[PDB]
Amino acid sequence: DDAICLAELKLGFIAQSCLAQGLSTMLANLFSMRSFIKIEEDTWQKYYLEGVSNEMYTEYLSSAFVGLSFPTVCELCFVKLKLLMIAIEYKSANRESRILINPGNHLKIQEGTLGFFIASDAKEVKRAFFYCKACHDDITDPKRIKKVKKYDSTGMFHWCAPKEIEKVILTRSEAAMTVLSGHVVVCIFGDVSSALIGLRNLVMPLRASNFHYHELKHIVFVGSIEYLKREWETLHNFPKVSILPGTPLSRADLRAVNINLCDMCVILSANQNNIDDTSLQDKECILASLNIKSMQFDITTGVNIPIITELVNDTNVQFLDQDDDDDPDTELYLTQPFACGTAFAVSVLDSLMSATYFNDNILTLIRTLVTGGATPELEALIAEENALRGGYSTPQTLANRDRCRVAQLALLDGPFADLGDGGCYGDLFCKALKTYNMLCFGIYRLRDAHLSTPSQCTKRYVITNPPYEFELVPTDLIFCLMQFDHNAGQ
Amino acid sequence: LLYFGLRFIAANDKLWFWLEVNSVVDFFTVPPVFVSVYLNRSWLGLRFLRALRLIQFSEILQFLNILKTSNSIKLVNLLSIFISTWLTAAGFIHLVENSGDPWENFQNNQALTYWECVYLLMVTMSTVGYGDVYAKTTLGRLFMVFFILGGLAMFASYVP
């Protein structure tokens, strides 16, 4: 019996985009049923439409995968069946879903282990159930295969002693001395007597327990102080949170906090429903977004600043970019700002209704990848106290920290620098599992990488689950699911 | 003919200028005069279309900066359209009735005058419909049936 909360999922998608850009537009494309579209001219649409063709399904596993570890099973599935198995649910007295599994930790219990796959359609997913080891070893083709309290009470979020609001408020001069790098700045346009968006759902995923303390990102709010105190009661238990009263439209405030040294800059509005005019909606968000693009610094220009903004009327997505070719007939999923991960409208979540009916476990696979890992036990505590009570540390609690997280890799240097120009995505995927046990499931490629003429725009788009023989350019980023490391240098 | 040449030059899209009511009435009015002069004969053909030139009055009066207010513009438009279409329909009935039926070898010829045809069209538009005069040929009846669809609504709307 499922309730689909729109605000929670939207804010979780945005927060996940904060850790790795483009993740919201990748995830929102896994729940819309779309077919393969092939085009001839060599544009970025050619690869984007191949990427968006995939959806996420689920089906049981054949008996050939009984006594095998998850990395080996995933590598076998990829290489042989051309399927990407992202996660499984571990049948027990009560069901539980594991996102990514290190070898030895979990062997397949064989009790009808339900696996989650990314593929073009269910027909291809059906191969995993019919896979016979002895019969299908020779068949290379995927076809022809036939029959002090620091953590939370539950130990899943970071926690700190309550702090009053006046101890975190900054001023324009005061914020100058503080040096902020790789933080998150949030712009809110709310005010008194306006709809109350739940800001807890935005910062809670960013404070998950699987991150080390030093890896946490500082959070700065820029908005009316009167609105903020209306919901500070649910925010004062999180570490490294600050407030800068003012207006995001003021170019002076945006310089006090080093907006040119950030990871994201979220733009939200609270009174979007009150407006009756269709055109005058999104006036604040569009104007604030354009303000940052025009700012000048002694990274030397505001165009390269990473920004995400929500919209209440998706036909206004045309105003977010200058070099795009606007058309009032193309759907939101195909325009450039959505393909780049710099926009998000709630209308793209309408497709989640039908996806939940056909396989109920989807809504619980997401909402743990997206939310920091909230459990029904925790939701009971918030219902009564509404204060996110903290607790002490026990070996059972400290064992909940070990779960995979979303990260973004770079091929410029490191172990994988050699494969930057060779161009075999399958080689990178296979090496990642057997060495560091990280799962790669996408490319975030420069918009003008295929063109021969050099360019200066640094916009990128998402390619979801590229084929095995895909070519790699050295200037691109890789989406990964990284195992939690219990010990790490500070 | 000369005035048609000037209008042709000043037009933007020649195709949509060609497919215009004034151009059509010029096409169906001017050449037959020269043809009749060459042949030393005559025929009362589609001459009733000359009443369709009354529509341009409301526009040339605005060109002359005579009409400036909305009420007068609307009144002139309504009057011109009503009178022009009434006279055109009367002329068509006159031609069809006085000529006959081509496939009948012209034996249905009913003697009517233009004033009588005008009276007939007025009675038909008013939906009064006496039995004193009426169309008796096939083409006349067909045109009357098709004119009843539009002229009745036009009369019901314009006169009040």
Partner: protein, 160 residues
């Protein structure tokens, strides 16, 4: 009902046709009889040197009879097209790529000064989004709203 359903059509649909060796400008915003009359009377005055730029209006409300009469009076040097400046199709219809400038008129006698400024800001944003090198001249009602135009990425005050 059938007569009404048929004939529901836009008489001012179409596309502007550029002329080699002649500039043109696009005027949008608060289009009305008095505003258009004043603007034309000041723009086409004889004291200015000889000019041959065309004026292309663009409004989403069909003009009334006396405004149409005004356009008839200025027949050979003023054109009207129906559409919205927030539509890329309309912006391409009025050939805004080669337009020398775009003028935006404002409603001084408006009830709420802020909404008019917001609408003008939207119009400017749309025009600059379609073509980021056109020259824009606009009217602002309040001073604190004029600072928002300084933050548009393509708004260059050094240029005109």
């Amino acid at each position: 009902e059938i007569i009404e359903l048929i004939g529901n059509r836009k008489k001012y649909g179409g596309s502007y046709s550029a002329v080699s060796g002649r500039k043109h400008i696009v005027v949008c915003g608060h289009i009305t009889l008095e505003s258009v009359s004043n603007f034309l009377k000041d723009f086409l005055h004889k004291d200015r040197d000889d000019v041959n730029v065309e004026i292309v209006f663009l409004h989403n409300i069909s003009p009334n009879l006396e405004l149409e009469a005004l356009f008839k009076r200025h027949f050979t040097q003023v054109e009207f097209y129906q559409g919205s400046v927030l539509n890329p199709h309309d912006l391409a219809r009025v050939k805004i790529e080669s337009a020398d400038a775009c003028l935006i008129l404002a409603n001084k006698y408006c009830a709420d000064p802020d909404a008019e400024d917001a609408s003008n800001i939207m119009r400017v944003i749309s025009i600059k989004n379609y073509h980021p090198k056109i020259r824009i001249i606009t009217q602002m009602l309040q001073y604190h709203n004029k600072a928002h135009l300084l933050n548009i990425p393509s708004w260059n005050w050094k240029e005109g």
